[PDB]
Structure 1
Amino acid sequence: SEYELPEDPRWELPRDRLVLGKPLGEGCFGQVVLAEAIGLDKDKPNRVTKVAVKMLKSDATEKDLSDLISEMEMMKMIGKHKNIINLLGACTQDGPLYVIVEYASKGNLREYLQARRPPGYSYNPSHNPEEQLSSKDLVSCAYQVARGMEYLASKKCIHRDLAARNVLVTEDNVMKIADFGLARDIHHIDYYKKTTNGRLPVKWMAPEALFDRIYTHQSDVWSFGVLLWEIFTLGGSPYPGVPVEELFKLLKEGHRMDKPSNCTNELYMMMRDCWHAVPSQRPTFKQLVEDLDRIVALTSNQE
């Protein structure tokens, strides 16, 4: 009420049409709760949709608020795509700011993959394992992420933290890139500081991002290579046993993670190409999409 929150009639949802439910997850993407929205779709005003609702914490500063507004406005400018988390609406009047986005019921991609490990990869940590993925399913996962990044890059959006923990999976097994709308911090950052889930984002950074804080579409392609490695280890942890100060050394001297046990030579070579030392020599997302499209069609669904 103290601030001028922007009301956009095309996106604004009355507060009374949002039935809030349980908090979602452990807060990696903010204070997010599950909800049911009534009549999100103006042609179907009596139908309910499950949605995720982002809000600010109790300790939120004016900086946290401006960031959430900016994230909302950035999602509008980027537009809709099947393979990103899409904006569905917002509540800016008669209460705290709510930003309403698509709900992904199967967790992030790392958790999705780990729960589908065969009991025979590292162990399956889920107490209720889910059915194993085919080789085609895994390549299709990579294809969908590539398609989401190709769309984001076409809108001049650089993700800067592309990783399996930032891909969410819907009930229909659609991959959606998350947390792309975020303004870049104006301060320098700590290379050793984990997120709230304890991830160590330096292991997804291209060397030019590591050493000189240069982020481009080409550095997202490097991260995509790390994500491909995460997919074919079914949620593995990159650079196992390598401390940060080692990692800096190792990348400079030109080594790269070893191929996952269950990964074709062709997909490993795509990983290695994404990890070209020279940014200009990496594939583009346009090329990756085309190549993964072809690989999906040729990859067996039988094992």
Structure 2
Amino acid sequence: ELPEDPRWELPRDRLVLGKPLGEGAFGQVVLAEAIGLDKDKPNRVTKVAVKMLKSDATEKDLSDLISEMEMMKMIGKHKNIINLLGACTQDGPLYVIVEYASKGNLREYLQARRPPGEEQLSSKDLVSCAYQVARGMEYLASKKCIHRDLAARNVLVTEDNVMKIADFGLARDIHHIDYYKKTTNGRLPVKWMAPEALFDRIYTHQSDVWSFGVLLWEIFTLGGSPYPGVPVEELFKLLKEGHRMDKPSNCTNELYMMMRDCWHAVPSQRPTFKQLVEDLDRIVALTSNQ
């Protein structure tokens, strides 16, 4: 059984479970409606996302879920991250309630708004999106949190087009990861990892800045796939040689200098998220919406 925490505990009959949002091998997430989430307003419903364990689940699976929830509690609230909203831990299965992003992940979001060959994105929108992710990371970095898998897939979009970093409190042991394991879409995660993290198993804020650069590339290609057709072994050889991706079309020289700056071979020489936030702020201001 779990110890109760009156800070986040919500009654089970106050949560109306709905349709599934997706599964995996660890757990599953479902859409739901929560009544009286806020103490002040107990007669209004709020759409939320609920994470739970699956059927044949180990004690390790359960321990990881608890860890994720605990990390979120300590980290605190921020507009550009998926925030914790409550939990059902007593007399039943564990339910972790978080904010709901109705427009899916950033990759999907971008791909659906590409030009034809329903909604479109201006240059300012793209830069604004980048600015939001940098702010989220800046906050997370301030609370000593290292993401380890920052990518477009792990960034969700709300109904009012707000970017929110997801899966940041995840518990994933180093040296147990499969480099050859692919994603649901068919991409390899090793393609977002800084060289030092990929070869020497060293994760830091600076390694997350490297992944942010690949994320910038994903934004300006509207959801492109990095290193398409490149297997793991050839990826290693490209990184050892200093290879860097080419500048996407309809990207300014200034934004492609930023990407390169994030991909600096020496980790101390890349910009911090505090700096990235400042630069993107000035760029958003000067970028056309026409």
Same fold by TM-score, threshold 0.5 exceeded? yes
User: For the residues of structure 2 that align with 1:29 and 1:163, how far apart are their CA atoms?
Assistant: 20
Cα offset, 1:251, TM superposition: 1.3
User: For the residues of structure 1 that align with 2:13 and 2:186, how far apart are their CA atoms?
Assistant: 36
Cα offset, 1:10, TM superposition: 1.5
User: For the residues of structure 1 that align with 2:25 and 2:264, how far apart are their CA atoms?
Assistant: 30
Secondary structure at 2:23's aligned position in 1? coil
CA contact (8 A) 2:26 2:61 kept: no
Cα offset, 1:198, TM superposition: 3.3
Secondary structure at 1:25's aligned position in 2? strand
Cα offset, 1:191, TM superposition: 1.1
Closer, same or farther: CA 28–117 of 1 in aligned 2, 3 Å = farther
Secondary structure at 1:35's aligned position in 2? strand
User: For the residues of structure 1 that align with 2:177 and 2:69, how far apart are their CA atoms?
Assistant: 24
CA contact (8 A) 1:83 1:174 kept: yes
CA contact (8 A) 2:174 2:201 kept: no
1:40-96, Cα deviation, whole Å (9 max, x unpaired): 000001110000000001011000101101100000000010000000000001210
1:138-191, Cα deviation, whole Å (9 max, x unpaired): 000000000000000000100000000000000000000000001231543221
User: For the residues of structure 2 that align with 1:190 and 1:46, how far apart are their CA atoms?
Assistant: 47
Secondary structure at 2:85's aligned position in 1? strand
CA contact (8 A) 2:262 2:270 kept: yes
1:81-131, Cα deviation, whole Å (9 max, x unpaired): 0000000000001210000000000000000000000114xxxxxxxxx31
Match of 1:265 in 2: 253
Match of 2:189 in 1: 201
User: For the residues of structure 1 that align with 2:195 and 2:93, how far apart are their CA atoms?
Assistant: 41
Larger deviation: 198-207 or 54-63?
198-207
Closer, same or farther: CA 28–218 of 1 in aligned 2, 3 Å = farther
1:242-265, Cα deviation, whole Å (9 max, x unpaired): 221111111111111111112111
Cα offset, 1:29, TM superposition: 8.2
User: For the residues of structure 2 that align with 1:29 and 1:277, how far apart are their CA atoms?
Assistant: 35
CA contact (8 A) 2:52 2:94 kept: yes
CA contact (8 A) 1:28 1:196 kept: no
User: For the residues of structure 2 that align with 1:29 and 1:173, how far apart are their CA atoms?
Assistant: 28
Secondary structure at 2:22's aligned position in 1? coil
Secondary structure at 2:46's aligned position in 1? strand
Select the residue among 154, 173, 191 that pairs with 1:166: 154
Closer, same or farther: CA 186–282 of 1 in aligned 2, 3 Å = closer
CA contact (8 A) 2:131 2:277 kept: yes
User: For the residues of structure 1 that align with 2:184 and 2:2, how far apart are their CA atoms?
Assistant: 28
Match of 1:38 in 2: 35
User: For the residues of structure 1 that align with 2:156 and 2:162, how far apart are their CA atoms?
Assistant: 8
User: For the residues of structure 2 that align with 1:80 and 1:29, how far apart are their CA atoms?
Assistant: 25
Cα offset, 1:199, TM superposition: 3.2
User: For the residues of structure 1 that align with 2:176 and 2:52, how far apart are their CA atoms?
Assistant: 26
CA contact (8 A) 2:50 2:97 kept: yes
Closer, same or farther: CA 57–36 of 1 in aligned 2, 3 Å = same
Closer, same or farther: CA 292–49 of 1 in aligned 2, 3 Å = same
**Unpaired stretches in structure 1, ≥5 consecutive residues:** 121-129
Stretches (4+) displaced over 6 A: none
Cα offset, 1:196, TM superposition: 3.9
1:251 aligns with 2:239: yes
CA contact (8 A) 2:187 2:225 kept: no
Cα offset, 1:28, TM superposition: 8.6
Larger deviation: 24-33 or 276-285?
24-33
1:298 aligns with 2:289: no
Cα offset, 1:133, TM superposition: 0.4
TM-score (norm 2): 0.97
**Unpaired stretches in structure 2, ≥5 consecutive residues:** none
Secondary structure at 1:168's aligned position in 2? strand
User: For the residues of structure 2 that align with 1:196 and 1:241, how far apart are their CA atoms?
Assistant: 16
1:97 aligns with 2:94: yes
Give runs of aligned pairs for residues 182-221 of structure 1, distance below 5 A.
182-221=170-209
Alpha-carbon RMSD: 1.3
CA contact (8 A) 1:29 1:179 kept: no
CA contact (8 A) 1:34 1:52 kept: yes
Match of 2:72 in 1: 75
TM-score (norm 1): 0.93
